[PDB]
Design an enzyme around this catalytic site. Structure first.
Site: not given
Ligand SMILES: O=C1CC(=O)N([C@@H]2O[C@H](COP(=O)(O)O)[C@@H](O)[C@H]2O)C(=O)N1
Ligand SMILES: O=C1CC(=O)N([C@@H]2O[C@H](COP(=O)(O)O)[C@@H](O)[C@H]2O)C(=O)N1
Lengths: 218, 217
Positions: B62, B64, B68, B119, B172, B175, B177-178, B181
């Site tokens: 996970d 996320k 680019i 969430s 996710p 629990g 977050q409310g 299940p």
């Molecule tokens: O919308 C989302 C995406 C997600 O991955 N998560 C992930 O799902 C898990 C939720 O854990 P928890 O049951 O609230 O403790 C965490 O690892 C969060 O980073 C979330 O809570 N909401």
């Molecule tokens: O809008 C954005 C945000 C960002 O952090 N970056 C980051 O900036 C760097 C750009 O590298 P480059 O000069 O295109 O090789 C990379 O580490 C990308 O992940 C980007 O290119 N655009």
């Protein structure tokens, strides 16, 4: 605000420890601020931050584009600052609570948060661009002082600078490989970020020197 | 994928010993573990291989992913090299960024999970309004795995409608977050539970309790 040498930040996205260290060391006399992201961290571990600090006298910006719920964002920021990162980059699209979570950790840990507003790639036009101005305004309302904006869209970078004000710190990626111009970008950004145009060059030092030469008057 | 008991453990503990102990205590109930940055940034990517070695569990990274295209490719490659079976990617950054992940996943025999709506409360500010379109984008790109919020069953139901019955959906927010299940499983194939399990006095009993409440499902 952090004093970025030559207004140039190296985006060190090589995924090999040896190469990353070699290139960073070769441009050390031109750059004192390095952006380390997940390509390198997930390949070599968070200890790479420690190694960079030990080997070079460079500030470290952890480009982790934090984009989770508040609770998870807090954990990510804590682990990142514990590793030695001076600052961390956070996405604004997940909302105010998610950003506030990062700001709170940065405040208690004595570090900085950079808020990523609009991105530089084509896909950013689909959803991010339409929310960018508001994300920036949200950052200002939350007290965010550091921001990230796109070099690839001068008009958008200009508007973002207006929203955050002249006192805020703004860094901009997209220079070089993505087409952004160093000089034009520095009309609005405090510092430019360059990755491939430097680390993939036959002579990274000459590449960095060339960029700096083109913006010497700035 | 076949998730045992339709329950995925969100292992967000930041200590290797505790993460391993707790996961081991609930291994009889779960065979799919979601590992995120809290654990990876604290213990390293080698933790993924260790989980596969100690447990017969699938690993969903996970992360996320929200960069680019070029960077997304590198992140996915590093993640799958570590042994992850799947990776979670944000849809907000656009189609090209998602496609970059799909390409690496195809190359290494892995799956991409598209995170549409989140969430937490903040998701209402920008993500929610783009969620339906992000889901449609996933459909257009051929995405088959999605992530939607347990905290908003009406939104989760809408996501299911858009992606169809064939797509796989995990959720996710159950629990801590409310989210409920049983209600969540009316739309999602599997639920994700973190704190309600790993922070419980007795993790095993917590997992057992959740499963007992959805026994008829
Ligand atoms: O919308 C989302 C995406 C997600 O991955 N998560 C992930 O799902 C898990 C939720 O854990 P928890 O049951 O609230 O403790 C965490 O690892 C969060 O980073 C979330 O809570 N909401
Ligand atoms: O809008 C954005 C945000 C960002 O952090 N970056 C980051 O900036 C760097 C750009 O590298 P480059 O000069 O295109 O090789 C990379 O580490 C990308 O992940 C980007 O290119 N655009």
């Amino acid at each position: 605000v952090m004093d970025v040498m030559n207004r140039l930040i190296l985006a060190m996205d090589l995924m090999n420890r040896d190469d990353a260290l070699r290139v960073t060391g070769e441009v050390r006399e031109y750059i004192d601020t390095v952006k380390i992201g997940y390509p390198l961290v997930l390949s070599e571990g968070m200890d790479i931050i420690a190694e960079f600090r030990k080997r070079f006298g460079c500030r470290i910006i952890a480009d982790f584009k934090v984009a989770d719920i508040p609770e998870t964002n807090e954990k990510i920021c804590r682990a990142t600052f514990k590793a030695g990162a001076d600052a961390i980059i956070v996405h604004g699209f997940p909302g105010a609570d998610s950003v506030r979570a990062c700001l709170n950790v940065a405040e208690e840990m004595g570090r900085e948060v950079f808020l990523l507003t609009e991105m530089s790639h084509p896909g950013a036009e689909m959803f991010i661009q339409g929310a960018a101005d508001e994300i920036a305004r949200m950052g200002v309302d939350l007290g965010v002082k550091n921001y990230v904006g796109p070099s690839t869209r001068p008009e958008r970078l200009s508007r973002l600078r207006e929203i955050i004000g002249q006192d805020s710190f703004l860094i901009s990626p997209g220079v070089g490989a993505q087409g952004g111009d160093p000089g034009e970008t520095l009309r609005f950004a405090d510092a430019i970020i360059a990755g491939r145009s430097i680390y993939l060059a036959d002579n990274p030092a000459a590449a960095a020197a060339g960029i700096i030469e083109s913006i010497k008057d700035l």
